[PDB]
Structure formats: structure tokens, C-alpha cells
Amino acid sequence: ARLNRESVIDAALELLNETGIDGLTTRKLAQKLGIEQPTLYWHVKNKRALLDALAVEILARHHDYSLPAAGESWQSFLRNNAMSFRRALLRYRDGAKVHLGTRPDEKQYDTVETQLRFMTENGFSLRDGLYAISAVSHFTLGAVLEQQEHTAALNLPPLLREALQIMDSDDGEQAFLHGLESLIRGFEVQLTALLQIV
Amino acid sequence: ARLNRESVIDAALELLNETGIDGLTTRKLAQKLGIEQPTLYWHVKNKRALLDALAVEILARHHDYSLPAAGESWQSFLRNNAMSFRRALLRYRDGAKVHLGTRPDEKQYDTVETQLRFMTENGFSLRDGLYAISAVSHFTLGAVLEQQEHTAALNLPPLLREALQIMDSDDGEQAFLHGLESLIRGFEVQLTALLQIV
Ligand SMILES: CN(C)[C@@H]1C(O)=C(C(N)=O)C(=O)[C@@]2(O)C(O)=C3C(=O)c4c(O)ccc(Cl)c4[C@@](C)(O)[C@H]3C[C@@H]12
Ligand SMILES: CN(C)[C@@H]1C(O)=C(C(N)=O)C(=O)[C@@]2(O)C(O)=C3C(=O)c4c(O)ccc(Cl)c4[C@@](C)(O)[C@H]3C[C@@H]12
Ligand SMILES: [Mg+2]
Ligand SMILES: [Mg+2]
């Protein structure tokens, strides 16, 4: 096996799709790579080091809308950025549980710094721009996690029976997209209100 | 040990606080209860059966605002219900990862049926009332999961340094509460718009 960082990240992503996150271990990864575990240890010290790097790589590889287009509104940037974030988290089995708990890596510093500056340039204070960006992140992580965990870990009253048919009718994309519009409209109301009672 | 359902759920909650969810196993629970694992098997068939029952019990025990008060508005019910849901999920180590992926249990049928009927009585269609209730659930699960997983699994530019001080200044409660108001205001805009272009 070639054991530079990119081929270790590639076999580990491959293995996450096959086993999920609880079945991903350095002993299984060494066997996939066809090397002994001391050989693997030289490259990958532990499972946290590995999950930290996968969380960065899945967004580097798949999260394409990380910055505003030139002249794009803050509303449009949040919509687009959230949908790209959903799409990157859903690309791999347990992608959202791999993200959970990470913080921006050094490789992401400039990207996330730009996102926050862009909201302050749009009128938000830093804290309000942060609370908007975080509410979009938490709603998206929540929606993808319920979806992915629902299919991993596997007498009704009339409206629940029907709620359950609706829920299960697609990937959760329509419920997501409609909730996203409500979130962005609530922030716009708050932005424009300024100091008036809203 | 007494091994009726309530004392097994009690020792298992106790054990979840000590070990977290990945260290919670029927072998560790049998040792906590001081019985042999065949004795435990008669009562608890497996870890999924156990996590399913804990997800129901933590809300039964701690989620107190599950129904609207008499005369309460839909806005106020969503605010209060979300905060109670956050509070119940945060009461135990990995409480939100225990919830993840469950669906309403038979013991919760009447409660969730009422919640959906209440939104349709407030003007929502069933699907729109469902999308509002789900967006509140997903945002709350997302915010508590990022919080709990951030503390479990353990050169900055100026606005990220400052974002990071703000984030970490409390439990995530202010970011949660502010995002909650934006979500509820976005649904109200959408409810009242009816068929007009909004
Ligand atoms: C999904 N989108 C809203 C963000 C995004 O697109 C990111 C990105 N690298 O392109 C993120 O890292 C993010 O997805 C993301 O994961 C962020 C993040 O985790 C976070 C945390 O943990 C603490 C402080 C801060 Cl400043 C952040 C924060 C706001 O930078 C976010 C940004 C979101
Ligand atoms: C946090 N709050 C919005 C809800 C709540 O308070 C519940 C409760 N038992 O009191 C739930 O079970 C909920 O927290 C909760 O977990 C629900 C839930 O999981 C869910 C899923 O999985 C699929 C279909 C439906 Cl109809 C539901 C649904 C909308 O009943 C929700 C309700 C939320
Ligand atoms: Mg993140
Ligand atoms: Mg639920």
C-alpha cells in the first residue's frame, strides 16, 4: 500500500462507507491497507486523529459553496452554503457524526474568517453574524444526523401516520429546505429591525 | 439487584453519565447491577433495546413542556417546547446522541398526535406544521449535539479568535435562544403570508 496522507485518508473514507464510524478502527484500517498495525501507527496515531482529518477532508473535497460569490447577498450565501454543507455531510456514511464536535481546522481559518467578515460587512454585529451562521450549521447538522442515524440504527393515530408518510417520502430535503427559508427570513427580520421593538 | 424495568433504566442512566454511550454495554451494565450477563439478557435483550428505552425515559422524566398550555399561542408553545427538549437532552452525558435516530414511541403517540393537531388548529396545514415542529427539533438536536460532542471528544485570525471566545462563553444557550427566535419568526411570516408572494 502507499501510505502518504492522501492514500491513508482515501482508504479511511472508503472504509467509513463500508463500516460506519463505530466499525472504523485503526486495526480494520491496517488490514484494509494490508499492513501491520505498527506500520499504520507511524502514519496515523489514533482514531481521533483520523476522524479529525476526515471531517476536514470531506468538506475540502465536497463542500464547494464555502465563500460568497461576488455581489451575492447574505441571504443567498447562507442558503447556498447550507445546502453545500448538507450535500458534503451526506456524501459518506455517518458523515455528520464525523463532523460532530470538530472546530475549524487551521486549513479552514481563512475560509471561516471570510464568512464572519462577510456577515459584518452586511450589517451584522460579529456576535449576531456568528449566531446566524451557527443556527444554520446546527439546523443542518441536526437534520442530516436525524436522517443518517435513522437509517443506520434500525395503532398509529391519524396525523402521526400521515406525518410519518410525509417524513419518509424523501431524504428530508423538503423539510430541510423549507426550514432553511424560515431561518433566513427570521434573521432578516431581526437584521432590519435594528433597535426597534420587533 | 432488583431487576424490574425501572431499576434497569435507572442503573443504565447512571451508567450513561459515567461512561457515555460508547462505553455503555450490557456487560458493563450487568457488572453495575452485580448480576451475571444471562440474568441481564432475560431482562434487556441488547444495547439498541436499551438505548431505545432510555430515549423515551429521559423525555418522560425530564421533558416537562410537551403540550401547549390552555390558550397558549403556537409561537409560545414552540419556544417553550424547544427549551424543555434542550433541557431534557442535556440532563445526561450524550443525552442527544441517545435520542438520535429514534421515532415517537407508542407511549408518546398521544403527545405527538396532540402537537400536530394543535399546529393544524393554528392554521398550519399538517405538512407545514410538521416542517415547523421538525425544524425546531433538528435545530435543537444540532445545537445540543455540537455542544455535548464538543466537550466529549477532546495563529487564529481576529474574528475567529473572537467568535471562539463568544461561542465558548456559555453553554451555547444564547446562540440557541437567539436562533430559536429567528426560526419562530420565519414560520410566522410564512403562516401569515398564505398565498401571497413573500
Ligand atoms: C456551514 N457553514 C455555516 C460553515 C462552513 O461552510 C464551514 C466551512 N469550512 O466552509 C465551516 O467550517 C462550518 O461548517 C463549521 O463547521 C463551523 C464551525 O464548526 C464553527 C465552530 O465549531 C465554532 C466556531 C465557529 Cl466560528 C464555527 C464556524 C461558524 O466557522 C462554522 C462555519 C460553518
Ligand atoms: C421537540 N418537539 C418539537 C417534539 C416533542 O416535544 C416530542 C415529545 N415527545 O414531547 C417529541 O417526541 C419530539 O422531540 C421528537 O423526537 C419528534 C420526532 O422524533 C419525530 C420524528 O422522528 C418523526 C415524525 C414525527 Cl411526527 C416526529 C415529531 C414531530 O413528533 C417530533 C416531535 C418532537
Ligand atoms: Mg463545524
Ligand atoms: Mg425525535
From Swiss-Prot, chains A, B:
Key words, A-Z: Antibiotic resistance, DNA-binding, Magnesium, Metal-binding, Plasmid, Repressor, Transcription, Transcription regulation
Repressor keyword on record: yes
Superkingdom as given in the UniProt entry: Bacteria
HTH tetR-type domain segment(s): 2-62
Molecular-function annotations in GO: DNA-binding transcription factor activity; metal ion binding; transcription cis-regulatory region binding
Record-annotated DNA-binding residue ranges: 25-44
Binding site for Mg(2+): 99
Annotated positions binding tetracycline: 63, 81
GO biological process terms held by the UniProt record: negative regulation of DNA-templated transcription; response to antibiotic
PANTHER family named in the record: HTH-TYPE TRANSCRIPTIONAL REGULATOR RUTR, TRANSCRIPTIONAL REGULATORY PROTEIN
NCBIfam families in the cross-refs: PRK13756.1
Role played: TetR is the repressor of the tetracycline resistance element; its N-terminal region forms a helix-turn-helix structure and binds DNA. Binding of tetracycline to TetR reduces the repressor affinity for the tetracycline resistance gene (tetA) promoter operator sites.
Subunit text: Homodimer.
Protein name (record): Tetracycline repressor protein class D
Species this protein is from: Escherichia coli
